[PDB]
Structure formats: structure tokens, C-alpha cells
């Protein structure tokens, strides 16, 4: 059963990263959406 | 012993996988928003 702790362990620090790359790319899509929205207010699209 | 060490890395794991779980869908509903902005743009003469 032991076994379970190294597998565990490594998963966790690969999915610890993998929060991290998502997170930036979820800041990414944050920020295009904002200046898409911006472009949009500028042009009279936005109401 | 090493049964409560195991039981406490479960649970960090469904912690960290329900997560990305999330950001994966919160990606995907940005890339959506972002489809749907730049087709505004484009029917308005913004994109060429």
C-alpha cells in the first residue's frame, strides 16, 4: 500500500505546475477579452 | 502511520484535479467569449 505515497506525491507536484500554466492562460484570455470588449465600447458596439 | 499520509495525499489530489478541472472549463468558456467578440468585430468592419 506504501507504494501509493511516491505516486501521489509526483502527481500532485505535476498538477501543481499544470494549475499554474492554466491559470496564466486563463489570465491571457481575461485580458484579450478586455480589450476586445474595450475595442467594441470605443466603436459604439458595446450599448 | 502511513494509511492517514495516503489518505491526505487523496485528498490533495482530488483537490488539485477538481482545479484544473475548473480552469480547463473556465478556458474554454474564454476562448468562446473571445470567438464571439471577434465575430462582432467582424460583422462591423473591424477585422479587414
Given at each position: 500500500?506504501?507504494?501509493?505515497?511516491?505516486?501521489?506525491?509526483?502527481i500532485?507536484?505535476?498538477?501543481?505546475?499544470?494549475?499554474?500554466?492554466?491559470?496564466?492562460?486563463?489570465?491571457?484570455?481575461?485580458?484579450?477579452?478586455?480589450?476586445?470588449?474595450?475595442?467594441?465600447?470605443?466603436?459604439?458596439?458595446?450599448?
Open positions: 500500500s506504501e507504494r501509493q505515497i511516491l505516486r501521489l506525491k509526483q500532485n507536484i505535476q498538477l501543481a505546475t499544470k494549475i499554474q500554466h492554466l491559470e496564466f492562460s486563463c489570465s491571457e484570455k481575461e485580458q484579450e477579452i478586455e480589450r476586445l470588449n474595450k475595442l467594441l465600447k470605443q466603436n459604439g458596439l458595446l450599448g
